Amino acid sequence: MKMRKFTIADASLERSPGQEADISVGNLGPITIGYGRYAPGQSLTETMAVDDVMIVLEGRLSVSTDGETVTAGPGEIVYMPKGETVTIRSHEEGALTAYVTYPH
Amino acid sequence: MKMRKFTIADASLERSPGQEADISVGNLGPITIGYGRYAPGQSLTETMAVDDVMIVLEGRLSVSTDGETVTAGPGEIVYMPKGETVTIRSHEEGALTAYVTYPH
Fold first, then answer.
1. Do B55 and A98 touch (CB under 8 A)?
2. Which residue, A30, A66, A79, B48, shows the most beta carbons closer than 10 Å to its own?
3. How far, in Å, CA of B32 to CA of B27, rounded?
4. Which residues pair with A87 in a beta bridge?
């Protein structure tokens, strides 16, 4: 309804130490905006609950599904569709991301 | 349906010299992914045809609607809803963006 600005500070990531955070900052549905943070050398595998358009801001991720792996560095986007099982691996400098999720 | 990666190179921006490009790189609807490029010191005003979630990658934009202005630098997101009239102003180093649009 109204213009809105978001920044990574809205994710208060210092409150959630650990190997990985993905925290929503807005619901625009719901179409949700968030930011993520991956510690160096972290791998996890998840079946996507929702369609996710992720952009790497800093560092680097590899994303794998089926028989196919891509790597995403700063400015690069990976679309991860609902129901696909993906492995996300952060590299030696970790990663920061932004993302948008949406429903069917 | 399948995982996909996009990068700013997919927008072939060298083909579109000028003061501003916003070029789609994928349709995921349609939910569309794109990248933008603004020359230094460029202002334009548009009524949004679609809801647009924009992230600044490099440089800086100011975005104004109604009585309110925000500025977005690298990593910062501006949501611009359908039907709102927005003025986008790029600063002295121009700007690069990524964005996602979607319909009602």
1. yes
2. A79
3. 4
4. A45, A64
